[PDB]
Structures are given as structure tokens and as C-alpha cells.
Ligand binder design. Structure first.
Ligand code: PU7
Length: 208
């Protein structure tokens, strides 16, 4: 059973700006997602120091970038802390509301879309390049879920019956027709080198 939810008005407004503004520097989406994966990995690492059993769902702390020309998708996989149903439906939005208001204020005043990460809302930069985003995620305290949105004001959540991931998040970017450059090995390698070369976990770029 698939449940359908409305974004909060502020978040729907941020998603339209991101979709609608003319802004050519779209590649920054990838460092925003990688950064989000890095924070989640820091989190579970930290939490495991005082509860070693939090890694029973997998000891390896890493990021995989998987392009699939066939599906036209690029997936950012992490084995970080993961997200609960409450995160997905409620808490992330609650937190994102104020980072959105700050981000929006900054833009007038002459900030640009590439600073979105300073405001804790860089996830939504996914919509620079993706027509639809699917997030598969698994937290220790909870079940595996699939979140999805093509923007338009709503998202769905369902329990995910696919391949169990153990622990972590996969962000699956269904790319726009004109953005398949981000499926190319030399392009991804270029962007990681430029914006993500210091991340403190291994990032494996899968080949097609
Ligand atoms: C804002 C920071 C936490 C949420 N989060 C994020 C950002 C985020 C994810 C979303 O998924 C549907 C929605 C909104 C988000 O930011 C507000 N990425 C994560 C990740 N890879 N692993 C764990 N938590 C993550």
C-alpha cells in the first residue's frame, strides 16, 4: 500500500524554484548528496562507539555511485545511519522548513543555488538534474521504505519489498532527458575530484 503526502508549502516552493530557475551550474547536486551520505556515515560511526551492535546491519562505511544508462538513473548509495518512516513523512520536512526560509532569503541578497548546502536542504538539488527521485532507506530502528517524488507538490511512501539493504540510503536519480551526461564515467569522476575529493569514506564509481 502506497501512502501519498503533501509537501509543506515552503518545501514545495523550494522545489519549484530549483526546477524553474535558470541556473547552468547543475553538477553541484552530486556533492550535496555525497555530503549528505558523509554526515549519515559520521552519525552511525559515532553512535557505534557506544553501542557496537548498531553495526550488526553491516560494518562497512562507504559510498557507491552507480550509473545505469539503460534505466537512465544515477544512484548514490551509502551504508550510513538511514532514515525512519518519521524522518521521511515528518521530521525532515519540519527541519527543512527553516533551512528553506534562510536559503530563500539569501537568494535575494545575491546568494546562488550552489550555496543550498549551507542551509541543510541540499537534498532538493537532486531536482536540478532528476525528473523523479526515489529514496530507498533502511534505519536500524525500523523497516525498509521507498520514498518517491516527481515534485508537483507531493511525495509517496511505501514499505519497500525490493532487495534488503542491511542499513543505509540509496538515492536514485531518474535523470531528465537532457542530463544523461551524469551517466558518463569521465563526467562523474570529474565532479567527485572537483567537489568531493576529501570525503572521509571510500567512494566507488561503478562502471557500466
Ligand atoms: C537534512 C539531513 C538528514 C536527512 N538525510 C538526507 C537529506 C534529505 C533526505 C531526504 O530523503 C527523502 C529528504 C530531505 C532531506 O533533507 C532535508 N540524506 C540522508 C542520507 N543519505 N542518509 C541519512 N539521512 C539523510
Amino acid at each position: 500500500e502506497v501512502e501519498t503526502f503533501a509537501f509543506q508549502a515552503e518545501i514545495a516552493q523550494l522545489m519549484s524554484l530549483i526546477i524553474n530557475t535558470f541556473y547552468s551550474n547543475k553538477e553541484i547536486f552530486l556533492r550535496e548528496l555525497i555530503s549528505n551520505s558523509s554526515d549519515a556515515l559520521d552519525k552511525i560511526r559515532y553512535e557505534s562507539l557506544t553501542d557496537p551492535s548498531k553495526l550488526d546491519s553491516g560494518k562497512e562505511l562507504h559510498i557507491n555511485l552507480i550509473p545505469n544508462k539503460q534505466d537512465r538513473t544515477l544512484t548514490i548509495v551509502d551504508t550510513g545511519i538511514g532514515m525512519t518512516k518519521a524522518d521521511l513523512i515528518n521530521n525532515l520536512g519540519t527541519i527543512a522548513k527553516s533551512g528553506t526560509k534562510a536559503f530563500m532569503e539569501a537568494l535575494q541578497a545575491g546568494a546562488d543555488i550552489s550555496m543550498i548546502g549551507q542551509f541543510g536542504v541540499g537534498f532538493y538539488s537532486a531536482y536540478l538534474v532528476a525528473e523523479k527521485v526515489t529514496v530507498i532507506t533502511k534505519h536500524n530502528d525500523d523497516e525498509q521504505y521507498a520514498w518517491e517524488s516527481s515534485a508537483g507538490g507531493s511525495f509517496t511512501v511505501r514499505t519497500d519489498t525490493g532487495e534488503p539493504m542491511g542499513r543505509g540510503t540509496k538515492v536514485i536519480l531518474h535523470l531528465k532527458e537532457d542530463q544523461t551526461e551524469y551517466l558518463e564515467e569521465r563526467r562523474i569522476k570529474e565532479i567527485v575530484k572537483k567537489h568531493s575529493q576529501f570525503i572521509g569514506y571510500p567512494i566507488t564509481l561503478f562502471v557500466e
